[PDB]
Structures are given as structure tokens and as C-alpha cells.
Design an enzyme around this catalytic site. Sequence first.
Site, mmCIF file in Angstrom:
data_model
loop_
_atom_site.group_PDB
_atom_site.id
_atom_site.type_symbol
_atom_site.label_atom_id
_atom_site.label_comp_id
_atom_site.label_asym_id
_atom_site.label_seq_id
_atom_site.Cartn_x
_atom_site.Cartn_y
_atom_site.Cartn_z
ATOM 1 N N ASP A 82 1.238 -0.611 -0.130
ATOM 2 C CA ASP A 82 0.234 -0.084 0.100
ATOM 3 C C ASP A 82 1.018 1.346 -0.071
ATOM 4 O OD1 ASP A 82 -1.713 2.425 0.480
ATOM 5 O OD2 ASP A 82 -1.681 1.255 2.149
ATOM 6 N N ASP B 150 -13.348 4.408 2.966
ATOM 7 C CA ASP B 150 -12.081 4.654 3.096
ATOM 8 C C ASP B 150 -11.715 6.377 3.578
ATOM 9 O OD1 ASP B 150 -9.445 4.798 3.110
ATOM 10 O OD2 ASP B 150 -8.522 3.671 1.271
ATOM 11 N N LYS C 259 3.019 11.152 -3.711
ATOM 12 C CA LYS C 259 1.668 10.357 -4.814
ATOM 13 C C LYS C 259 0.628 11.533 -5.192
ATOM 14 C CE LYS C 259 -1.724 6.951 -3.610
ATOM 15 N NZ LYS C 259 -2.514 6.106 -2.322
ATOM 16 N N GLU D 201 -6.660 0.004 -4.544
ATOM 17 C CA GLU D 201 -7.343 -0.071 -3.030
ATOM 18 C C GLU D 201 -7.880 -0.436 -2.511
ATOM 19 O OE1 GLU D 201 -5.708 3.839 -2.125
ATOM 20 O OE2 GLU D 201 -3.977 3.928 -2.683
HETATM 21 CL CL LIG Z 1 -3.642 7.135 -0.843
HETATM 22 MG MG LIG Z 2 -5.284 4.203 2.665
#
Ligand SMILES: [Cl-]
Ligand SMILES: [Mg+2]
Length: 383
Positions: free
Chosen positions: A12, A201, A72, A176
Site C-alpha cells: 500500500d 475509506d 502520490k 485500493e
Molecule cells: Cl492514499
Molecule cells: Mg489508504
Amino acid sequence: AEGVFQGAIGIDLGTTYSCVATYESSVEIIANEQGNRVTPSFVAFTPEERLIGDAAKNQAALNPRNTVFDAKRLIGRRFDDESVQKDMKTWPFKVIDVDGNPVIEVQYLEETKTFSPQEISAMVLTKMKEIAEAKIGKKVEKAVITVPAYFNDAQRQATKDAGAISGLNVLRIINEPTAAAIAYGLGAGKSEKERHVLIFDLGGGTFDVSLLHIAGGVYTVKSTSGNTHLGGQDFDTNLLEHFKAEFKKKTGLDISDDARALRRLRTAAERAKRTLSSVTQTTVEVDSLFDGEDFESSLTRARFEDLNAALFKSTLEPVEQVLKDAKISKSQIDEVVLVGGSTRIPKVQKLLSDFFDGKQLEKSINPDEAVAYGAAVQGAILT
Ligand SMILES: [Cl-]
Ligand SMILES: [Mg+2]
Ligand SMILES: [Cl-]
Ligand SMILES: [Cl-]
Ligand SMILES: [Cl-]
Ligand SMILES: [Mg+2]
């Protein structure tokens, strides 16, 4: 094959924190050298060395121009992109335009150097690889890396490319939310009985909601929504301001310009939030907060909730959007999976369980670890 792990680690690669897991005889999340099960997605450059992860984040305040984070937010994007141009005004490190791509420029060993976002992410991924290697006792060559479901083809490729740079054979890039579902074994039978699964999330700095259709081994993202820039840290921020106000009111002191005092008080607030996920009242103390004065207050779960009323409520919006957009009613939803530390907040669970008319939420896997866990599961399937 000698001295090489035959599996694929699961990574991750988060915006702010990264997490690595493997599945030998069971799925294990791997702790780093400071004993932490997540690792800041941070790279620092100094006159003497490069730091990755916890050490990099810990000296960020001392070395802001040359401590790189949020790569990211750049990876697979263009310099003149609107999110980018905007994000850059918020970062203390330099981002320049090279052939229309964003590139990070820093001082390192007393020289100017530049790095693509993929190069920075590769350094984080190398760190994750090394963390895994230390616990496995073997070299790691293969990985499954996760990315947000809204990532486009350039963002996905740039992420694979980062993996290649870090010496990983990236077997798959998976979404994800899909990883989180795999973590819970949803669709594991590969049976033709279908399911619809909502992934909620709520990260420290991100909020993503995704609707999955799963049947016969195929995980299809039907719809996706969220608040890129809302997250758990926003709950802390509201408590911090409440405490600052109280302190200034009792003592006449404003700690706004004392970074250390602010840091200690935000730590108190983060701790107070966590306590209040388990119990309903707590004292909040900081010894010698400012100019000799101790900070002491108390906080109930009810007050914590009121202080974040609007925010909490706002979390149902993207759940409604995702259903609306997928043309799927809440009654067709089979599992609701919680991801991100903030999903431990009782009110958040309650608003969500009430919306689904008392449905129980999937939360038995540590919400900060679930994505890595499913990436590790996928890695074992592929090896
Ligand atoms: Cl993230
Ligand atoms: Mg996450
Ligand atoms: Cl993150
Ligand atoms: Cl101190
Ligand atoms: Cl203290
Ligand atoms: Mg004391």
C-alpha cells in the site's frame, strides 16, 4: 532462487503513509526498524545522507526545503495540471517544470538534484521492500502495489515504473478498494454468486468511497466518490482549535507561533480522539504547554462529536453519490468495509450503520492495514 522469497509482497503506497504485508503461512503486516507497522511516505535529503520513512518525517520541520512528501499527488501528472499547480503552493519543497512534467528539486550532499515523482516513490518502495526483507530473511523480487480506483492509465503506469526502479517485478497494480475486499475474502470462492460491496475509506488526509461488483473472481469498480482533501487529521484540527481557544481564554496565552507548543497540543488532541473511540470521557493534559502554564481540560465523546458535527455528517454524501451513480440501492449492498483509522470513531460507524438500516460493518482487520493485507493476499494468489 537461493535466498529469494518465492512470494510477492503486498504494498500500500499511500499518499502520507505506506504499509507492507506478506502471506507465508498467514498474512502478516511488517514493522519497520522503529517498530512501526506503517511508514511515512517521506524522503529527506541532507548535506550528508538520504532518509526514508520515519526519520525523514521526524526532521521535516528542521529541513523543509529538502524533505519531500505527497509525491502520490504528482505521479503520472503534468506540470500544468490544475490539481498540481494548486498542490505546489502548499509544499515547502521546489517543484519545477521539465518537458511539461513536474520534477522535484532539492539540495542533497550540497548539490542541486532533481527527481521525478516516480523516482521519489521508488525510494519509498525500496524502503518497503527492505522492511519486508528484514523480516523475511530473504531477498524480495515480486510485488503487488495498490493505487486509488480513480487513478488513470498514466498514474498506474508511473506507479509500476516506480516499482521497476526499486528493483521490484510488479505483478499487478490493483485498486485500493479491491485490495480491502480481497483482504476480507469477499469473492475468494470465485463463485458465480454475485456481491455488491461498498468500501468506505477515510484516511488521515483522504476520503474515498467505492462500489464494487464481484462475481466469478472479477472485481469491478462500478462507481467511485470522495473528498480528496478531507480526512482524519481534520478531526484533530477541530479539537486542536477548541483546546487552543480554551487555553488562551484561561491564561491569555496564544501558542499560534510556537511550533513545539502546537505540536504537543495536537498530539494531546490526537490521543484524546483515540481514547474517545473506546471510552466516553477523558482529561486532556499538556505539562508546561507555554510560558510555564500547564494545559488541562476534559472532553466527552458527545462534545467531540459536536465539535465535528458537519464533517461527520458530510461523510454520507459520497456513499449516496456512489449508489446514485451506479444505479444500485442501499438494500443491494452486501458488505460495507471500513478502511482508514478514522473509521474507528463510534459516530462514524453509527452514521454509516444507520444509513444501511443497522447493517454490521466489516472492520475486524486493522483499518490502516487492510489495503496492504489484501495486496499480500493477491500476491499469494499470483505466486
Ligand atoms: Cl492514499
Ligand atoms: Mg489508504
Ligand atoms: Cl495515506
Ligand atoms: Cl517540551
Ligand atoms: Cl505532557
Ligand atoms: Mg503535569
